[PDB]
Symmetry: C4
Amino acid sequence: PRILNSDGSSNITRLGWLDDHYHDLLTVSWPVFITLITGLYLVTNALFALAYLACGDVIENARPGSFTDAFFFSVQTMATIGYGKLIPIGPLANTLVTLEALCGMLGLAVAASLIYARFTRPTAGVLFSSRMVISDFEGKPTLMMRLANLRIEQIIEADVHLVLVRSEISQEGMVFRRFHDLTLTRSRSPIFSLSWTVMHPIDHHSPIYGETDETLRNSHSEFLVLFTGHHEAFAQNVHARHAYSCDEIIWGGHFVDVFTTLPDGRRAIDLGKFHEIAQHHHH
Amino acid sequence: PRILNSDGSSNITRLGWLDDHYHDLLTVSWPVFITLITGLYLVTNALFALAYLACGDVIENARPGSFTDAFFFSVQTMATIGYGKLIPIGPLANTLVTLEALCGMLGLAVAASLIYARFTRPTAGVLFSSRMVISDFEGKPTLMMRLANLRIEQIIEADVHLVLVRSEISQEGMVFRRFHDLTLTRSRSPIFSLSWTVMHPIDHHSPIYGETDETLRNSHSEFLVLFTGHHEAFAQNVHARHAYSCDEIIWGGHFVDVFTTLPDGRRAIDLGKFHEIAQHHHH
Amino acid sequence: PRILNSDGSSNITRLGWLDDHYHDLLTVSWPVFITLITGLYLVTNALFALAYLACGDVIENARPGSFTDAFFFSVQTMATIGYGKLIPIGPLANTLVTLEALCGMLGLAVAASLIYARFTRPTAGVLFSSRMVISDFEGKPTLMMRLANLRIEQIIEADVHLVLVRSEISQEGMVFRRFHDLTLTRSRSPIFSLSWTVMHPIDHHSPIYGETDETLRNSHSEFLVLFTGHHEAFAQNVHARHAYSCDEIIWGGHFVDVFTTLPDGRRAIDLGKFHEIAQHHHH
Amino acid sequence: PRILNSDGSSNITRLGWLDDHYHDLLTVSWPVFITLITGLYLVTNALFALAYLACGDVIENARPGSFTDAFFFSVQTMATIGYGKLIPIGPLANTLVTLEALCGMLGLAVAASLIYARFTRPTAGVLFSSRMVISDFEGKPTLMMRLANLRIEQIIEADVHLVLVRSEISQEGMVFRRFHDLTLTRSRSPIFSLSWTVMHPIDHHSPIYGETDETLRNSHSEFLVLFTGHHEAFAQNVHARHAYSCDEIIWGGHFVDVFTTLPDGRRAIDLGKFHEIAQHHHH
Ligand SMILES: [K+]
Ligand SMILES: [K+]
Ligand SMILES: [K+]
């Protein structure tokens, strides 16, 4: 019954048409977006066609009072193909022409921006260790997990937050869900390029100090990771979030090493070891 | 007589043509912007038309010395419909043609950028509690208000500032308006997704320490909220501001709750309760 | 003989073709930029024309072996006017056609970005007090100056740096220019909207502590101001810099006030007072 | 056998098609990118051509059932040249027409964004001293290197990180690589314009305290520099990274000086001295 999913998205039921137009256009699925555009496209040409007929027989080589001919003319026009069979006749015809044109291009201008706006979304090539572990490092138990960059490009002034979420009681006895930042031995990495193992020493200041497994389940406590940085690939900021549940903490585990020396004597990164955690089994 | 409005915009009278072109173009109302563009469009084609006539009878199938014909030709040319009735004749005609073309597309290039520049502005889907309250939490009064995210998308590394603005006297006796940043128990929320109740404990460090209602009116003091964060919807930064007056502080009040358990046993959010503040009435 | 000019640009002599293409294109003056584009435009069409002639007589209604005809055809083709007199003939002709097209639009795509890149530069509407003053505020002498926003739109997350630059001697006796950032009583203003008077208290920590005028001239010391913030007008970041020399510090001065109460009882801003500094003259 | 290259890119062997489409498109060499686009272009027109043939003889003046004719028609249609020889016939023909158009325009919209996305990348004009030096400044040994801005434009709120990377042993005996950010006497420069000599005093807090050369080689330790700032040239953020190996530290060296006084008495910047380091040779 987790508040937060693994993908980091909160897991709640929300209780609530043209109001949020811009958001909605960037939020819709590509199929839909393309449809909408199409609809709009067809629609407006039809409208324009009617305008033509309305004037009445103002297009060269158009079957009299036929909406198709006018429509297709309108596309050839708006789109500025301007084949040349169907042509404006008389001031009224042409004014509508020079109006459509402008309309068409403006639409392109609007479509473009939407496209570009929705199209230009980078994604940190970042991979999260499927598990956390609690184990002794430098003489104090420490909670860790690790990120691997999935691309050759580097992430600059990357940094990460390790947030514990769990239930608490106020002195007043309000029983709420609280967020605790957890101090990391290293929270900034100005140049993140291969792997980073993040650590929260556990000492008298850690909100998870002297806590067993039993106690963690009991506060229904999870761990939320937010990573962010400036990706050289995109020359644009990127982020990535992940969440862990009490039971994805492997007590005493140790992340295996992904750094190797080749036969060649050249260093290397093996991603295969990335999700592997060493463990002592005591029968 | 408030210095700051609810929308957070300061409430002062300011005492002060082509100077600020770029700002103005992004600042104008869409109707106006479109008009301007249109004007510019029509205008330039007229100019071009004149250029054509000026050469004299250089367009196929054009009524001799008729501006309309030239004008409409110019549009068909500059929008590159290029129907094909009206056509250039001779070097002068065509040079003007190849000039217009380029002109037209440059205009598109300029129009586009403006459009995109004005078009691409997100808005945090954030709603502010209409009131603040001063109530005891964990043993110290605390001033609070709360934000609710209005969209399914999440806001990352969101954070908020609670600023008290009020009149003061210097030892030197300068009577000025000063801004105090009020320490919040929680000022960052790396993953804002549903509701956030912001709190400023009031203790010997709070500029509103041991202050009643009477004293607040007296310094003509208001409270300004700035919220900001990176919206996943837009993959871009968003902000929202709000302001409160002394009298929108509900002393002793408690925000009602918005988190529920369904019959189903599934957690939920209710945004009807959002503006509701519990209160004790003592006859 | 100032190191820094009033406009904040350093005042030094620097001692040093296709290398910096992108910078150069954004750095050039509009006339020039347009020329370059034009040149490129004309040029490429000429090249294309030659390609056509090179096939030989492959365009309908073209005077045999005539470059003009080919050239103008090439424009009508690359701008996609496609009038319809001059037309491709045979495979070679048309392939070149379908190649040009693509070329043309790609050029548009490149031109656009440049245009937009150079076009979309905001400027903080910020005005700097022409002078600084040193005077007692809240019981310690304080250096100050002030900014006024020149537009109705607000600046978010605005903040400012007050940097003293002056010559120093190392224990080793290196005589260098050093920068001292000066602690301001208020360095962030999450919502800058009208005027902000920035202050650097002078106490045992101020690098200008117990310094007279004489001593300031002597270290040839100046004061550099950098302001930056996110402008709601442009929905984009803005900055502004300014510099002051030792002699633009008005000792004992006090900035006059720009905030008024109207007859109406409505508050107001008078930016005429903005540069005015009160002063005591003692015969 | 360095972990990090001079360009700051980590020097490891990574061990691991349509997955990363957007990154890949921005990452590919211009030649390749253009090819891809071209391919896509040609391809889609061919597809469209087939669509035409498939209806069968629906284009005016088209050799019956010939792909070339259809193909070239398709381009004239999709690029909206619309010459006018080949023309749609009947409903099926034209619908495909009005579909292509839109398609073409959308492609432009997509191409543009890619172009602009890849095209609009600035590069800090920043040059790194080829060497570092360890030498006494103001009475404590200090590690330094220096940056020179290579362009007339200025970089705002520039700042730099000096990171030591070297192998260590945990008490638990884990032998890992660790990063130490090294406190710099000056880490921000709100207005970087000519040269900046960065310094890390070495004292009881420096992770390189009481370390000789021998000891540095031994921990296989390098030094990583990240510089970043907002470039006025591009009105956009820029960064630059560099790395140094133990052996590019010139002990006792002193950077020569690049600031000069002209005969004219005007100050100047010479960048020939930039890489020059003074040294005492003791036979
Ligand atoms: K056309
Ligand atoms: K066209
Ligand atoms: K045509």
